Design a protein around this ligand. Structure first.
Ligand SMILES: [Au+]
Length: 124
């Protein structure tokens, strides 16, 4: 039932200006988006832009994906993001993260009809 497009929304969208949280944004968000349920997802990026602006990237700069597929796209403008990376002390089920806020060009893999973001590949 969860589509690839919905999965990208759950894993990566957080439309707001920038990270807001009552406590460590990554620890709160990784848990709340279910990214610590089955393992500690080790790296994950949230994007603080509108869905439309993220979706439009699928029509922007065609770039190779890290895995060698050719269906990746880089945003022409920088976007507000937050990068979550597991700490050394993190051990599932007590997942723990370092929060890095940034303004970078995103790279997403797009798939489907409609052609929409389904994976977050890199920020540059
Ligand atoms: Au640039």
């Amino acid at each position: 039932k969860e589509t690839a497009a919905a999965k990208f929304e759950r894993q990566h969208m957080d439309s707001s200006t920038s990270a807001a949280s009552s406590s460590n944004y990554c620890n709160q968000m990784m848990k709340s988006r279910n990214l610590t349920k089955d393992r500690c997802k080790p790296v994950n990026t949230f994007v603080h832009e509108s869905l439309a602006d993220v979706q439009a990237v699928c029509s922007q700069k065609n770039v190779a994906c890290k895995n060698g597929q050719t269906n990746c796209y880089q945003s022409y403008s920088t976007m507000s993001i937050t990068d979550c990376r597991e700490t050394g002390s993190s051990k599932y089920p007590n997942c723990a993260y370092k929060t890095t806020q940034a303004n970078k060009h995103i790279i997403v893999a797009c798939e489907g009809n409609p052609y929409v973001p389904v994976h977050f590949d890199a920020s540059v």
